[PDB]
Design an enzyme around this catalytic site. Structure first.
Site, mmCIF file in Angstrom:
data_model
loop_
_atom_site.group_PDB
_atom_site.id
_atom_site.type_symbol
_atom_site.label_atom_id
_atom_site.label_comp_id
_atom_site.label_asym_id
_atom_site.label_seq_id
_atom_site.Cartn_x
_atom_site.Cartn_y
_atom_site.Cartn_z
ATOM 1 N N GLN A 111 61.723 28.497 43.862
ATOM 2 C CA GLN A 111 60.727 29.558 43.989
ATOM 3 C C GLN A 111 61.225 30.706 44.868
ATOM 4 O O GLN A 111 60.784 31.839 44.689
ATOM 5 C CB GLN A 111 59.366 29.077 44.490
ATOM 6 C CG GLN A 111 58.773 27.951 43.644
ATOM 7 C CD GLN A 111 58.719 28.272 42.166
ATOM 8 O OE1 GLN A 111 58.189 29.298 41.714
ATOM 9 N NE2 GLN A 111 59.325 27.394 41.378
ATOM 10 N N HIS A 138 62.179 34.107 43.260
ATOM 11 C CA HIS A 138 61.176 35.014 42.737
ATOM 12 C C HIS A 138 61.348 36.426 43.301
ATOM 13 O O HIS A 138 61.061 37.393 42.616
ATOM 14 C CB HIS A 138 59.758 34.483 42.961
ATOM 15 C CG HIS A 138 59.267 33.595 41.871
ATOM 16 N ND1 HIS A 138 58.997 34.106 40.624
ATOM 17 C CD2 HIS A 138 58.932 32.319 41.851
ATOM 18 C CE1 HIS A 138 58.537 33.112 39.855
ATOM 19 N NE2 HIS A 138 58.491 32.034 40.570
ATOM 20 N N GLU A 178 50.372 28.412 48.086
ATOM 21 C CA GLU A 178 50.117 28.532 46.665
ATOM 22 C C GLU A 178 50.440 27.212 45.957
ATOM 23 O O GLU A 178 49.666 26.717 45.152
ATOM 24 C CB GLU A 178 51.028 29.637 46.140
ATOM 25 C CG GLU A 178 50.804 29.932 44.662
ATOM 26 C CD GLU A 178 51.877 30.720 43.983
ATOM 27 O OE1 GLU A 178 51.696 30.945 42.757
ATOM 28 O OE2 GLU A 178 52.885 31.113 44.603
ATOM 29 N N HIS A 179 51.629 26.667 46.244
ATOM 30 C CA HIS A 179 52.137 25.457 45.618
ATOM 31 C C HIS A 179 52.507 24.482 46.725
ATOM 32 O O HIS A 179 53.139 24.867 47.723
ATOM 33 C CB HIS A 179 53.414 25.724 44.820
ATOM 34 C CG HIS A 179 53.306 26.678 43.703
ATOM 35 N ND1 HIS A 179 53.919 27.908 43.727
ATOM 36 C CD2 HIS A 179 52.730 26.546 42.524
ATOM 37 C CE1 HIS A 179 53.720 28.488 42.538
ATOM 38 N NE2 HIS A 179 52.980 27.674 41.792
ATOM 39 N N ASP A 211 54.823 25.894 36.604
ATOM 40 C CA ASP A 211 54.997 27.280 36.239
ATOM 41 C C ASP A 211 55.027 27.450 34.728
ATOM 42 O O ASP A 211 54.472 28.414 34.218
ATOM 43 C CB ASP A 211 56.296 27.833 36.808
ATOM 44 C CG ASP A 211 56.342 28.019 38.316
ATOM 45 O OD1 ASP A 211 55.271 28.025 38.955
ATOM 46 O OD2 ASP A 211 57.470 28.219 38.812
ATOM 47 N N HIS A 260 5.799 42.789 48.013
ATOM 48 C CA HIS A 260 6.161 41.451 47.567
ATOM 49 C C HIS A 260 4.926 40.547 47.548
ATOM 50 O O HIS A 260 4.682 39.827 46.591
ATOM 51 C CB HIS A 260 7.242 40.823 48.477
ATOM 52 C CG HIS A 260 8.654 41.275 48.256
ATOM 53 N ND1 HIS A 260 9.096 42.558 48.494
ATOM 54 C CD2 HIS A 260 9.739 40.598 47.774
ATOM 55 C CE1 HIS A 260 10.391 42.640 48.209
ATOM 56 N NE2 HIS A 260 10.805 41.455 47.749
HETATM 57 N N1 NAI Z 1 50.852 34.111 42.635
HETATM 58 C C1 NAI Z 1 51.216 33.706 41.415
HETATM 59 O O1 NAI Z 1 50.543 32.861 40.782
HETATM 60 C C2 NAI Z 1 52.390 34.283 40.756
HETATM 61 C C3 NAI Z 1 53.136 35.262 41.373
HETATM 62 N N2 NAI Z 1 54.225 35.837 40.769
HETATM 63 C C4 NAI Z 1 54.919 36.961 41.447
HETATM 64 O O2 NAI Z 1 54.861 38.117 40.651
HETATM 65 C C5 NAI Z 1 55.853 39.023 41.179
HETATM 66 C C6 NAI Z 1 56.437 39.826 40.055
HETATM 67 O O3 NAI Z 1 56.997 41.011 40.654
HETATM 68 P P1 NAI Z 1 57.805 42.039 39.762
HETATM 69 O O4 NAI Z 1 59.042 41.408 39.228
HETATM 70 O O5 NAI Z 1 57.990 43.240 40.636
HETATM 71 O O6 NAI Z 1 56.854 42.387 38.527
HETATM 72 P P2 NAI Z 1 55.451 43.150 38.417
HETATM 73 O O7 NAI Z 1 55.156 43.182 36.964
HETATM 74 O O8 NAI Z 1 54.460 42.535 39.349
HETATM 75 O O9 NAI Z 1 55.764 44.646 38.967
HETATM 76 C C7 NAI Z 1 56.363 45.628 38.111
HETATM 77 C C8 NAI Z 1 55.481 46.844 38.132
HETATM 78 O O10 NAI Z 1 55.300 47.214 39.523
HETATM 79 C C9 NAI Z 1 55.632 48.579 39.652
HETATM 80 N N3 NAI Z 1 56.139 48.830 40.990
HETATM 81 C C10 NAI Z 1 57.240 48.256 41.572
HETATM 82 N N4 NAI Z 1 57.512 48.738 42.760
HETATM 83 C C11 NAI Z 1 56.536 49.702 42.971
HETATM 84 C C12 NAI Z 1 56.306 50.603 44.031
HETATM 85 N N5 NAI Z 1 57.039 50.636 45.139
HETATM 86 N N6 NAI Z 1 55.252 51.441 43.918
HETATM 87 C C13 NAI Z 1 54.509 51.394 42.804
HETATM 88 N N7 NAI Z 1 54.657 50.624 41.729
HETATM 89 C C14 NAI Z 1 55.700 49.796 41.875
HETATM 90 C C15 NAI Z 1 56.689 48.809 38.578
HETATM 91 O O11 NAI Z 1 56.941 50.176 38.313
HETATM 92 C C16 NAI Z 1 56.034 48.082 37.407
HETATM 93 O O12 NAI Z 1 55.006 48.830 36.772
HETATM 94 C C17 NAI Z 1 56.846 38.162 41.980
HETATM 95 O O13 NAI Z 1 56.763 38.416 43.383
HETATM 96 C C18 NAI Z 1 56.412 36.742 41.625
HETATM 97 O O14 NAI Z 1 56.734 35.803 42.630
HETATM 98 C C19 NAI Z 1 54.669 35.359 39.533
HETATM 99 C C20 NAI Z 1 53.912 34.520 38.823
HETATM 100 C C21 NAI Z 1 52.729 33.918 39.377
HETATM 101 O O1 3SL Z 2 17.447 41.302 46.189
HETATM 102 C C1 3SL Z 2 16.913 40.295 46.645
HETATM 103 O O2 3SL Z 2 17.331 39.070 46.370
HETATM 104 C C2 3SL Z 2 15.622 40.246 47.452
HETATM 105 O O3 3SL Z 2 14.546 40.528 46.509
HETATM 106 C C3 3SL Z 2 15.397 39.009 48.319
HETATM 107 S S1 3SL Z 2 14.274 39.319 49.669
HETATM 108 O O4 3SL Z 2 13.113 39.956 49.029
HETATM 109 O O5 3SL Z 2 14.929 40.187 50.620
HETATM 110 O O6 3SL Z 2 13.890 38.019 50.195
HETATM 111 O O1 3SL Z 3 53.913 31.775 41.695
HETATM 112 C C1 3SL Z 3 53.869 31.252 40.455
HETATM 113 O O2 3SL Z 3 52.892 30.720 39.970
HETATM 114 C C2 3SL Z 3 55.184 31.281 39.715
HETATM 115 O O3 3SL Z 3 56.017 30.259 40.262
HETATM 116 C C3 3SL Z 3 54.997 31.158 38.182
HETATM 117 S S1 3SL Z 3 56.381 31.756 37.266
HETATM 118 O O4 3SL Z 3 57.494 31.019 37.863
HETATM 119 O O5 3SL Z 3 56.476 33.194 37.381
HETATM 120 O O6 3SL Z 3 56.188 31.238 35.906
HETATM 121 ZN ZN ZN Z 4 12.704 41.110 47.211
HETATM 122 ZN ZN ZN Z 5 57.995 30.109 39.818
#
Ligand code: NAI
Ligand code: 3SL
Ligand code: 3SL
Ligand code: ZN
Ligand code: ZN
Ligand code: NAI
Lengths: 436, 436
Positions: free
Chosen positions: A248, A251, A318-319, A352, A411
């Site tokens: 990982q 990445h 995350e993992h 993944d 109310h």
């Molecule tokens: N949390 C999760 O479940 C998962 C997380 N990931 C993460 O996703 C990420 C993928 O990153 P990338 O390869 O960059 O792909 P991405 O698709 O997230 O980013 C590419 C896009 O970001 C824009 N971008 C890049 N740098 C920029 C900047 N400085 N300002 C504005 N826009 C910018 C690019 O122009 C493009 O449009 C990795 O960090 C990976 O670890 C991957 C899969 C799952």
């Molecule tokens: O938006 C709301 O849930 C309200 O009507 C709740 S209370 O009347 O403030 O108890």
């Molecule tokens: O952060 C994640 O979930 C990634 O490890 C998924 S992937 O490896 O981009 O498929």
């Molecule tokens: Zn109310």
């Molecule tokens: Zn991965």
């Protein structure tokens, strides 16, 4: 008895300000100037001048050479993700119950209408991410699914990402990356179909853009740069632990790899091995993982299992892999993680790509309050109720009294009115009318 | 064609910019200055110089004169909320399943550790809001519940609000209002216990503060100025429909009251009656409801039930009452609302105070993607998995191939390493190694 054998200079918090500044600027521009702002960002950032919405003919043309063997692997993975998603869907039930006599109340479970799914493409092309979102939305019974992936290397959507989107059931596919993709899906730019929920992983900019647009849209979870943690005792294999951390770390420069262990020998062997494995990687991976391990990698030696649980829950990775004896105990006692990998046999990379449970998962401590993308993120749990007139005698008098205690006279009048209509001879204490 | 018999100048969107400007400034000050900024805001906004965290003795002293009848009503309401919350808790199950043979995957459902609950106090004192949050968190099995309500009318927490917090099971209670309350709960100021999830309703500033802090914390839902919609056919009673609209219009100047109907006669009579009812309200309510009805009130005439469903789903009202024949059909066909009130007998005020289902509900269209506060908002739905070695033959080769298609060599190596360790004599296709 807790000791950092390797301490990180940087954490997932380090880059918050950088991401927020960029996203604030870009969202402001897109709010002001709509599609034109998006086309400009696509050009300047991604080298893209072509059409954004792909036609069916374009989708077919761009995937026509994708081989049978590739399609078979992606199809198998889509099935595993779908199978688990359907199991998760069955775990949330509708019901009704009687409360006070004559009060019926229930829960409806209803899919959202439009989902926007992002699949990243930058350092790598995220084929698996492409089906993790779309396949789950379809499993939830979402009627319209819009999907975006970044133009990849000054060309269009990576063809295998494209196949994955199409095969998983995307209704609309756009060649659009990053913040501008997330904003476009939130506001319904190009399609005229604003998303109810926007999902999917990405870099710090993508993750911040979704976090920021929450409210306008629902989201799955804050899903930023990938994280891995391993819990290991003396039974663990250092070569496999090390491999799993490096897996990982490739990445990107911001991906933390964390080892929590009760075995100094294991810690020592892993710290020696990780650099060696990184050095044997190809260029792009070596670039990412060298910086990630140096800057964000940590190794923590703990005296007891209880201490490991405390540290692990605080990190809320995350993992989380668990290479220990007595795995039942760990499943019972760990409480903050995105996705858990029990035993050596499974591993993050399997999750993944094809295990079945979603990989789109909380980072930056969001596992303290959410699991990952799932069908549950597409289902609304709404309440309903219905009463007999008899039920309103108790419910209405309590409502009138509490309302008046709060200062809410209008109310209380809604209760007064029903009491007078339904039970004109009844006399209840409905509370002293509010005068101010 | 859909006819607006009353059109609003303003919508829940109108005041977004105002709220965002204040929240951006206050959250910057609190991030920078901590408790000092919160104390400053407590004094400047709320006139408060006292201690912020209440001691057990202060809680007892401040509630000692609350009468038995008031306690009995609040206790009854808490029981109804708890009863429904426990039913909701039963509706989300843990499970495990076999996917590919030898792959066990499951879902764990775990409560968050710390919840912060806000109960508003400004125009009115929100006694019911106080138990809506706390009682639900306790029903979910959250071990630490922090509760804030604004100093009210020159004293501290309204005593009945305080009784509600205490009776519902709050662990820590703070006399603290608005944005500073939300932020204090998110950051653990004054308690050293940062919340995992912050919940509860409030004005546009409170709601925007929660929306903005999402990420740092989880939230229930965007729960801002109250909204009410009524669906009515010719069977409805205009006097009751009007009373119900006015009931929620008293919440504040920004509370929308919407009537969707197939009956022109009903619309006409309600439009005549609403001003008359408002004119008979005491001053605070009359002040709120006059502005709310004028600026945000809408009356929409539709030709068919299907048209009504389409408009109601688009409005996605926090609260939706249905005064029609054939209520089963409406339950089956409506899809975007926070909380549904079927038939004339129940009404929004009942749900606000004591019906059972939570009142803390999506506004500003959030019902397109979320229901209200409930035990579901305190549970994390996490995934876990475990494999036999045998399962890794298929899972590992698919993982290695897909990984390499994506360009993720280190990912594939974690599969290679397992295949070599577990099955040294197998010769599967693990994909062409990545070289770039
Ligand atoms: N949390 C999760 O479940 C998962 C997380 N990931 C993460 O996703 C990420 C993928 O990153 P990338 O390869 O960059 O792909 P991405 O698709 O997230 O980013 C590419 C896009 O970001 C824009 N971008 C890049 N740098 C920029 C900047 N400085 N300002 C504005 N826009 C910018 C690019 O122009 C493009 O449009 C990795 O960090 C990976 O670890 C991957 C899969 C799952
Ligand atoms: O938006 C709301 O849930 C309200 O009507 C709740 S209370 O009347 O403030 O108890
Ligand atoms: O952060 C994640 O979930 C990634 O490890 C998924 S992937 O490896 O981009 O498929
Ligand atoms: Zn109310
Ligand atoms: Zn991965
Ligand atoms: N969506 C839902 O489920 C529910 C919504 N509500 C809504 O909650 C709201 C309660 O509003 P209030 O009476 O105002 O109580 P509140 O408790 O939300 O607000 C009072 C606090 O806000 C601060 N505040 C007010 N104006 C400010 C400003 N201009 N700048 C900074 N801080 C400011 C005050 O100083 C105080 O700390 C109503 O609009 C009501 O309809 C009520 C219950 C449930």
């Amino acid at each position: 008895m807790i000791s950092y054998l390797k301490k990180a200079e940087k954490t997932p918090q380090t880059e918050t300000a950088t991401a927020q500044k960029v996203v604030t600027e870009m969202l402001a521009e897109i709010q002001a100037r709509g599609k034109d702002a998006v086309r400009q960002y696509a050009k300047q950032l991604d080298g893209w001048s072509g059409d954004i919405v792909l036609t069916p003919d374009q989708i077919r043309e761009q995937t026509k050479d994708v081989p049978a063997g590739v399609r078979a692997d992606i199809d198998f993975a889509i099935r595993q993700v779908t199978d688990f998603a359907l199991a998760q869907r069955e775990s949330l039930k509708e019901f009704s119950v009687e409360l006070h006599p004559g009060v019926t109340a229930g829960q409806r479970v209803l899919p959202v209408n439009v989902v926007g799914c992002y699949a990243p493409a930058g350092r790598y092309a995220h084929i698996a991410s492409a089906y993790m979102g779309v396949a789950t939305a379809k499993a939830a019974g979402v009627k319209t699914v819009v999907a975006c992936s970044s133009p990849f290397r000054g060309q269009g959507i990576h063809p295998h990402v494209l196949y994955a989107f199409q095969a998983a059931g995307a209704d609309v596919i756009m060649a659009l990356g990053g913040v501008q993709a997330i904003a476009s899906m939130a506001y319904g730019l190009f399609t005229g179909k604003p998303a109810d929920v926007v999902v999917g992983p990405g870099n710090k900019f993508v993750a911040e853009a979704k976090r920021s647009l929450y409210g306008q849209v629902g989201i799955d979870v804050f899903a930023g740069p990938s994280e891995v943690a391993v819990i290991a005792d003396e039974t663990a294999d250092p070569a496999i632990v090390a491999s799993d951390l490096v897996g990982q770390a490739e990445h990107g420069h911001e991906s933390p790899a964390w080892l929590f262990t009760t075995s100094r020998d294991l810690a020592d062997r892993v710290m020696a091995l990780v650099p060696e494995l990184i050095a044997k990687l190809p260029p792009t991976a070596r670039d990412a993982a060298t910086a990630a391990w140096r800057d964000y990698g940590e190794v923590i030696l703990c005296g007891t299992r209880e201490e490991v649980v405390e540290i692990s829950d605080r990190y809320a990775s995350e993992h989380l892999e668990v290479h220990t004896a007595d795995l039942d105990w760990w499943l019972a006692n760990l409480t903050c993680y995105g996705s858990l990998f029990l035993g050596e046999e499974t591993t993050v990379a399997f999750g993944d790509k094809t295990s079945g449970p979603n990989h789109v998962l909380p980072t930056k401590g969001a596992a303290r309050y959410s699991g990952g993308l799932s069908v549950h993120k597409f289902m609304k749990t709404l309440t309903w109720q219905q009463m007999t007139r008899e039920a309103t005698r108790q419910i209405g008098q309590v409502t009138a009294r509490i309302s008046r205690l709060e200062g809410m006279e209008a109310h209380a009048r809604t209760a007064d009115d029903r009491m007078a209509k339904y039970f004109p001879n009844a006399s209840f204490e409905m509370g002293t009318p509010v005068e101010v």
